[PDB]
Design a protein around this ligand. Sequence first.
Ligand SMILES: CCCCCCCC/C=C/CCCCCCCC(=O)O[C@@H](COC(=O)CCCCCCCCCCCCCCC)COP(=O)([O-])OCC[N+](C)(C)C
Ligand SMILES: CCCCCCCC/C=C/CCCCCCCC(=O)O[C@@H](COC(=O)CCCCCCCCCCCCCCC)COP(=O)([O-])OCC[N+](C)(C)C
Ligand SMILES: CCCCCCCC/C=C/CCCCCCCC(=O)O[C@@H](COC(=O)CCCCCCCCCCCCCCC)COP(=O)([O-])OCC[N+](C)(C)C
Ligand SMILES: CCCCCCCC/C=C/CCCCCCCC(=O)O[C@@H](COC(=O)CCCCCCCCCCCCCCC)COP(=O)([O-])OCC[N+](C)(C)C
Ligand SMILES: CCCCCCCC/C=C/CCCCCCCC(=O)O[C@@H](COC(=O)CCCCCCCCCCCCCCC)COP(=O)([O-])OCC[N+](C)(C)C
Ligand SMILES: CCCCCCCC/C=C\CCCCCCCC(=O)O[C@@H](COC(=O)CCCCCCCCCCCCCCC)COP(=O)([O-])OCC[N+](C)(C)C
Ligand SMILES: CCCCCCCC/C=C\CCCCCCCC(=O)O[C@@H](COC(=O)CCCCCCCCCCCCCCC)COP(=O)([O-])OCC[N+](C)(C)C
Ligand SMILES: CCCCCCCC/C=C\CCCCCCCC(=O)O[C@@H](COC(=O)CCCCCCCCCCCCCCC)COP(=O)([O-])OCC[N+](C)(C)C
Ligand SMILES: CCCCCCCC/C=C\CCCCCCCC(=O)O[C@@H](COC(=O)CCCCCCCCCCCCCCC)COP(=O)([O-])OCC[N+](C)(C)C
Ligand SMILES: CCCCCCCC/C=C\CCCCCCCC(=O)O[C@@H](COC(=O)CCCCCCCCCCCCCCC)COP(=O)([O-])OCC[N+](C)(C)C
Ligand SMILES: C[C@@H]1CC[C@@]2(OC1)O[C@H]1C[C@H]3[C@@H]4CC=C5C[C@@H](OCCC(CO)CO)CC[C@]5(C)[C@H]4CC[C@]3(C)[C@H]1[C@@H]2C
Ligand SMILES: c1ccc2c(c1)CCC[C@H]2Nc1nc2ccccc2[nH]1
Ligand SMILES: [Ca+2]
Lengths: 82, 91, 1105, 92
Amino acid sequence: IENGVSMHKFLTIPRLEELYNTKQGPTNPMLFHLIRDVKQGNLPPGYKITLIDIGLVIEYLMGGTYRCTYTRKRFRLIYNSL
Amino acid sequence: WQHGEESMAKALVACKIYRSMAYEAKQSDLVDDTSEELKQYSNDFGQLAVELLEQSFRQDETMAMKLLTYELKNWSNSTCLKLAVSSRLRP
Amino acid sequence: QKSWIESTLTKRECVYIIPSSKDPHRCLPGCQICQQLVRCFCGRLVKQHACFTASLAMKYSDVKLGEHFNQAIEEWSVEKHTEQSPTDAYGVINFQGGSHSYRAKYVRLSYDTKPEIILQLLLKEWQMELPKLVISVHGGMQKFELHPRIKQLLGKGLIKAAVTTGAWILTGGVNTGVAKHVGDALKEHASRSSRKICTIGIAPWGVIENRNDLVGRDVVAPYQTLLNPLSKLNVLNNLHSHFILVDDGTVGKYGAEVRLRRELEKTINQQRIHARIGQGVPVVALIFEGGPNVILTVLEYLQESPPVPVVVCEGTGRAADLLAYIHKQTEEGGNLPDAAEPDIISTIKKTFNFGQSEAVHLFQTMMECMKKKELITVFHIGSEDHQDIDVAILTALLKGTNASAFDQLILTLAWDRVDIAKNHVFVYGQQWLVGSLEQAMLDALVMDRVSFVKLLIENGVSMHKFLTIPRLEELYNTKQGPTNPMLFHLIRDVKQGNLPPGYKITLIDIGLVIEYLMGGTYRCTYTRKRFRLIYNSLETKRFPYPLNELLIWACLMKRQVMARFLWQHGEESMAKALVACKIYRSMAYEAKQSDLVDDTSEELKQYSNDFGQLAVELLEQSFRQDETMAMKLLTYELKNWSNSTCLKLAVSSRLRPFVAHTCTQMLLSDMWMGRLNMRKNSWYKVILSILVPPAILMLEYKTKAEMSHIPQSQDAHQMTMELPITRKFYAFYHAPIVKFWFNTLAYLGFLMLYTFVVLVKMEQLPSVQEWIVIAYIFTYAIEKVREVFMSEAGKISQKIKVWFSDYFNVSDTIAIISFFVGFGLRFGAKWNYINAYDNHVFVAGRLIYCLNIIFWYVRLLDFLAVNQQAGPYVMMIGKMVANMFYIVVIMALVLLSFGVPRKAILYPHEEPSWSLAKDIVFHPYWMIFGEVYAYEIDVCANDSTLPTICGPGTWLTPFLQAVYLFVQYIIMVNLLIAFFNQVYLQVKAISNIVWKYQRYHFIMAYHEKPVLPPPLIILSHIVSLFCCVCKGPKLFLTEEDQKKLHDFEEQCVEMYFDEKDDKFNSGSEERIRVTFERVEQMSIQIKEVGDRVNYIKRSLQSLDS
Amino acid sequence: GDALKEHASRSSRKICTIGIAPWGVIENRNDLVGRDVVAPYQTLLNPLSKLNVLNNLHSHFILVDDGTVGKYGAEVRLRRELEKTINQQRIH
Ligand SMILES: CCCCCCCC/C=C/CCCCCCCC(=O)O[C@@H](COC(=O)CCCCCCCCCCCCCCC)COP(=O)([O-])OCC[N+](C)(C)C
Ligand SMILES: CCCCCCCC/C=C/CCCCCCCC(=O)O[C@@H](COC(=O)CCCCCCCCCCCCCCC)COP(=O)([O-])OCC[N+](C)(C)C
Ligand SMILES: CCCCCCCC/C=C/CCCCCCCC(=O)O[C@@H](COC(=O)CCCCCCCCCCCCCCC)COP(=O)([O-])OCC[N+](C)(C)C
Ligand SMILES: CCCCCCCC/C=C/CCCCCCCC(=O)O[C@@H](COC(=O)CCCCCCCCCCCCCCC)COP(=O)([O-])OCC[N+](C)(C)C
Ligand SMILES: CCCCCCCC/C=C/CCCCCCCC(=O)O[C@@H](COC(=O)CCCCCCCCCCCCCCC)COP(=O)([O-])OCC[N+](C)(C)C
Ligand SMILES: CCCCCCCC/C=C\CCCCCCCC(=O)O[C@@H](COC(=O)CCCCCCCCCCCCCCC)COP(=O)([O-])OCC[N+](C)(C)C
Ligand SMILES: CCCCCCCC/C=C\CCCCCCCC(=O)O[C@@H](COC(=O)CCCCCCCCCCCCCCC)COP(=O)([O-])OCC[N+](C)(C)C
Ligand SMILES: CCCCCCCC/C=C\CCCCCCCC(=O)O[C@@H](COC(=O)CCCCCCCCCCCCCCC)COP(=O)([O-])OCC[N+](C)(C)C
Ligand SMILES: CCCCCCCC/C=C\CCCCCCCC(=O)O[C@@H](COC(=O)CCCCCCCCCCCCCCC)COP(=O)([O-])OCC[N+](C)(C)C
Ligand SMILES: CCCCCCCC/C=C\CCCCCCCC(=O)O[C@@H](COC(=O)CCCCCCCCCCCCCCC)COP(=O)([O-])OCC[N+](C)(C)C
Ligand SMILES: C[C@@H]1CC[C@@]2(OC1)O[C@H]1C[C@H]3[C@@H]4CC=C5C[C@@H](OCCC(CO)CO)CC[C@]5(C)[C@H]4CC[C@]3(C)[C@H]1[C@@H]2C
Ligand SMILES: c1ccc2c(c1)CCC[C@H]2Nc1nc2ccccc2[nH]1
Ligand SMILES: [Ca+2]
């Protein structure tokens, strides 16, 4: 950051999809347990997490009427587009 | 957290994420506890907010009360004082 | 427009097309290549000239057909071939990435902007407060390199000599010039993250990357600095606030930006520093490593008028090295070693890869530089030359612009740099025209510059000479400095109206404030006839004691740091710190009362209590030096502060740590004795002497050499001067301790009689024991009437308000009224001879007595509180009754929670009644106090006192009552116990102070109480009033004793300001602080020095080998 | 006197400097003319001045009076004549 990485340029959708979907670093087993709960089922075998699935967590974690950028129609439409 | 903006709404969302994760840990036991490692992580964010409110209240008591009620619009049209109440942050 | 910026400023665009190349490097029909690779003297390409009409001028090749006298065009007039337009850019650069998204601003203006047009946006649009200094940096444009010492040391100064001042640094902005290194200092030496040094970096629209990103009206340009070495456009340096993007119509090239830089650096030298100062904001110039055009422009400052100085530093590099290398030669300019001019030109030859044909004029340019070796401050970075660079810059301005030491002082007074003054203005032999020093004090005072006040006092400004009437009239009437809005609100109140439009405050109007703030009978010098006559008239137009007039000024204008400075100077330091504490405290109460501005009211009560603690810490220092004289310091009439006292002031400021200090508590006891010596005597002998008057003569009195420190009455001092027997009875009976124990034995003879009347039957007429009782209260009433009329004031509205403000003057009024209601109904009534107590008027007054009696037994806690063990419990019995009200409301919510069900469940056939108001409150209250009503619980049980209350639902009450008492005793009563345990140590360390402070008002009520007790005090009223129809306790010091006392106060103040100095400078946390700061400054001169040693030994062994 | 301030001892009866002054090189000589008078003395550092102001940090003075003004003289006589009788008084 102190040598010229403006996160606006480096935070695209597919990059940040990885950052959740990496065992290549310190991981939290809750996140793969939360996502399978809100989906109300069982994750398929491979299952790269989608950012929609994260919104369904944070809107579940924060709770009440919290509505995250990920679940909204704008993001949900440019996401399935790409 | 310390980078970006909205540093008082980010430290009260964080404190509510962890706190709401910790309560899932205690509820379901599929792994090691982790649940007191988070409640110390939440209360670490839920104390930078409070120590940042004081720093504002000690600079302008008026505006520092606007910092508690301005609709945020990045954090779901919410408030830096409705979050704390949701994290049950008393300080 | 909604934007004054683009309403005023404009933008240059090349509105015409001028090719600059003709030869077809490729594709012989030049029209094709001229499209994409033939640029204008506009700098931009011929097709980048969109300019909508010029976009259609992208015909076959462009404007001006190929031949057109081939060499014809090649000029690009910036006047008509480059028109103006409203600015399309103006926003805030984001600098996305690098430190918390630090901000900066711009417009993209044209250099067309006249110099005055450029200044009149920087202030009002960007809200950049006017500077005290200007540190334009005119060094090298191409990047250069420095040594680790000079890198950070020059980064100390550009932070130091600019954070103190305002210092609009003028840079190039780009991250390649001097703009590069200056920004690196702003981060390494990152000041307190605030409005730091606002660097106003003029940028060209030429060497600039992301120029398109700047094109936005109110747009946060998402700017990002690429360090791509293939890049050529220069990115703006990171640490720079507000930019000026000078727009010449061209791109990539230099030019116009240099024009603006003079043209703002010349109008800021035309703006004034501050309303008080008449000078203009000066301008300096700093050089880092320079260049060929630099050596030219360094000089023209030294030539042009006004003589803008320069701070060319020697260590930086190429040009600046040699401009300073020549300073080590070429002594006083014209003297020139002709053998060195080949040598230095040989140094010029090697640095700039420089020509010898050009070696005369560039060398010549360094001559007129050296002809002006007075204001070219060649800072020798190596040594301590003139100091660290911070001082060098500020020192360069003073010494060199042909300015008087006054004119040098008025600048440093604006900068608020005292160290400049103590070591470059107050140095040595120097003219110091005395009238000048005076005028400078007038300016340091109106602002707040305490440090120059101290400086000027310590260089010969006797305030007696400099405090005349018209000067001090200003000091109130200046908005040219930190002001207090109260003062203009107080003055319009006491005048009872509205100030006229202009209204310079008169010092009379101030007296009407201080006599209102301090209050009571305080009468200030200003309102008196002497001052009021010499004032309207206009060394008589001076003041006797000036720092008594400035100290009441700095406390009305909320200038603490001056008040602490003017307090510690002068004399009467303990009366000045208790007047101040009363001024602020009396200002704070006006703030809370009227809300026309921000509160300010807790900013003062901390300012008062800061003066009301230096007094107390100065009493202790005296009491610890001579307990006797230190009790004279509390009672000597002051005569500068309205014939007042350093202990009547504290009482008016309600300052408890002074009145309840151990020196105001010995004196109050030495005043409690009187002439008696109740050290040698005993309390038995007082009472023995009051009832046996001859035993007065067998008492051990004090001598008038022991009563020196005690204040004595008017005629009391007359006695001692001119022990005889008539002066034994006068000395005893006029002692407070005697006045006390001569009432307490009439009052305890009052309470033994009234009690006797209360308890014993009461006949048609009062008895002997009852007339004496009426007589006490009457004469006790009069004694409280007279206590009003003589309560040392003029306002009846204020006397009456301070009388009823004491707890007992009300209760006594309740108890005196009630008694004569009682005697009214008791005596003013009929008599039913067959049976008394049938007359409900008689009964009524009878029962006023039996209840009025309670007022008089609680009096005894006034008398009983004289003791130092008892009183501090009598004061607790109140501070808990207050703080416990809410535990006791709950206990009455629990008491009706039980009483209303218990009374409904058990007594269900109740018509409305007043017994439903008792019976829901009665038993549940006595339950709290040991009672259970055991044979009334379970009314259906066999062992019942209430076998008639049995019926449907009455089995619920044992449960209700079980829950009730559990809540009362086991929860709420132990909440009281727990309360009284934890509010005991608090209220005990307060009830002492509340007691020691009511002691003043008790003892100093006996010094003006009569001698005779309130059954026969009437004689001492009779024999004070009919004698009054025919027509305080002061410290009588001779003349030398005033002198010995003043010598004592001066001595004790000196120690106070000297022991605090020791307790801090020779503590621990301060001593770790110094040991840190030493080992800092050591370790710098360890590694530096120790390096050099190694650079010797590696040589020394090679010198000999 | 400059040492008496830089190294300002505990503010008390410090070293009582008994500075013999002549009635010669002395400014504000008229201000000194007062029987039991607090001479409102002020040191002017006017470089145009020629009369020498008393140094700040000095307690008790001896203003030796020769009848003349501006010139030296008599003061040196006293200085032996006190420095010779104090060598005649005993320490204790
Ligand atoms: C014998 C048969 C009849 C009598 C038996 C029954 C007697 C009933 C009980 C009586 C108890 C009497 C003592 C308490 C009353 C206050 C005393 C006082 O000085 O208070 C204050 C004066 O505060 C003021 O503001 C100035 C004057 C207030 C007068 C208020 C009278 C209230 C009592 C109504 C009349 C009752 C008379 C009923 C009779 C018609 C002193 O201060 P403080 O109180 O320590 O604290 C408050 C602080 N304050 C000053 C900022 C406010
Ligand atoms: C420092 C200031 C604080 C102290 C305040 C001090 C002032 C004190 C304040 C007092 C105010 C209270 C009111 C006045 C009291 C009487 C009220 C009353 O009811 O009177 C009654 C008697 O009235 C008579 O005239 C006959 C008896 C003599 C009156 C003696 C009371 C006045 C004494 C005052 C000496 C005070 C001077 C003290 C010296 C300064 C009238 O009613 P009644 O006759 O019962 O009705 C008949 C009914 N029946 C026939 C059916 C039976
Ligand atoms: C159902 C029953 C329910 C209860 C009924 C009531 C009973 C309980 C209550 C009783 C008294 C209520 C009124 C007076 C007290 C109020 C004031 C106080 O508490 O302290 C205040 C004054 O007072 C003092 O500082 C001194 C305390 C005086 C002692 C009280 C005598 C009680 C004895 C009577 C024995 C007679 C017994 C027999 C009677 C027949 C001090 O408080 P503070 O915190 O400093 O506040 C600020 C003060 N300031 C503004 C001056 C700075
Ligand atoms: C939730 C928190 C925990 C609570 C703890 C337990 C709570 C309490 C539990 C108590 C146990 C239950 C007791 C009542 C049982 C029935 C009584 C009955 O049948 O008749 C009785 C009627 O009298 C009553 O019913 C009155 C209620 C009893 C007293 C309540 C307890 C209070 C003291 C203890 C509270 C703390 C004790 C602590 C416990 C160790 C008597 O017989 P009878 O003949 O019908 O009446 C005489 C009429 N005759 C003369 C006309 C014939
Ligand atoms: C805890 C250890 C001790 C033992 C525990 C074992 C418990 C066993 C208990 C069992 C209760 C049942 C027995 C009574 C019914 C039979 C008839 C009877 O006597 O009726 C009575 C109703 O009195 C009651 O109903 C009593 C209270 C019932 C609740 C018992 C306590 C609950 C537990 C505790 C928590 C409760 C809350 C407490 C606060 C937290 C009326 O009879 P009387 O009063 O004589 O009136 C007769 C006259 N009359 C006809 C004119 C009206
Ligand atoms: C305002 C201030 C005044 C100052 C005080 C001095 C002036 C006041 C003094 C005296 C006034 C009274 C004089 C009149 C004659 C007395 C008659 C009488 O009652 O006699 C009784 C005694 O006396 C008492 O019982 C009442 C008087 C004395 C005790 C109460 C007051 C004590 C306080 C004041 C002194 C100590 C103070 C110490 C405190 C530190 C005896 O008679 P009896 O009981 O009726 O029974 C007789 C027998 N027979 C019925 C069978 C026949
Ligand atoms: C300055 C302030 C003054 C205060 C107000 C002054 C008020 C003055 C008020 C009254 C004076 C006049 C008295 C007569 C009243 C009319 C009724 C009447 O005549 O007789 C009736 C009296 O009935 C009662 O109730 C008498 C007692 C009431 C007194 C209440 C005072 C409260 C003040 C508390 C202390 C205040 C403390 C203040 C603290 C600051 C009945 O009696 P009778 O008919 O004569 O004959 C017997 C009847 N029988 C046949 C049935 C047996
Ligand atoms: C007529 C014949 C003669 C005898 C009659 C008189 C007998 C005596 C009467 C009372 C008792 C006091 C006697 C001892 C006094 C010692 C001196 C002393 O220190 O006094 C203190 C208290 O001073 C007071 O005045 C306290 C109040 C007493 C009078 C009111 C009665 C309260 C008690 C009744 C309540 C109801 C209880 C009812 C219980 C049934 C004040 O001084 P200090 O600050 O403590 O001083 C110590 C340091 N110094 C000395 C160096 C200064
Ligand atoms: C020891 C206590 C009694 C003596 C009273 C005399 C001393 C009282 C002295 C100081 C205390 C506080 C100030 C005085 C009260 C003013 C009103 C008030 O504050 O109301 C408060 C609510 O209060 C309620 O809601 C109470 C209403 C019901 C009163 C019933 C009394 C019950 C006790 C009857 C006995 C049954 C006992 C049963 C068995 C134990 C409102 O809060 P506030 O005003 O913002 O707060 C205080 C602000 N202040 C401090 C600046 C003023
Ligand atoms: C009458 C007024 C009513 C209106 C209220 C006044 C308000 C209060 C004002 C003022 C207060 C003081 C003066 C008035 C009260 C005392 C005088 C008095 O009334 O004596 C009475 C005589 O009483 C006796 O002969 C019995 C013993 C007492 C005599 C000495 C008086 C008491 C005070 C001594 C020590 C302190 C004094 C020393 C000071 C240096 C006369 O009263 P009377 O009602 O005319 O007579 C009725 C019948 N009787 C004769 C049987 C009693
Ligand atoms: C917050 C708290 C809740 C509880 C409570 O305080 C406030 O609410 C209050 C209301 C009161 C009643 C109002 C009116 C009357 C009528 C009157 O009728 C006279 C008739 C006749 C007599 O014979 C005249 O001749 C008798 C008294 C009674 C019932 C009051 C009793 C006390 C009560 C219950 C008070 C109780 C302590
Ligand atoms: C009950 C008891 C005393 C008191 C009150 C209430 C209300 C305030 C006045 C106070 N009286 C008092 N007498 C004193 C004698 C000596 C020193 C301090 C004293 N304070
Ligand atoms: Ca009990």
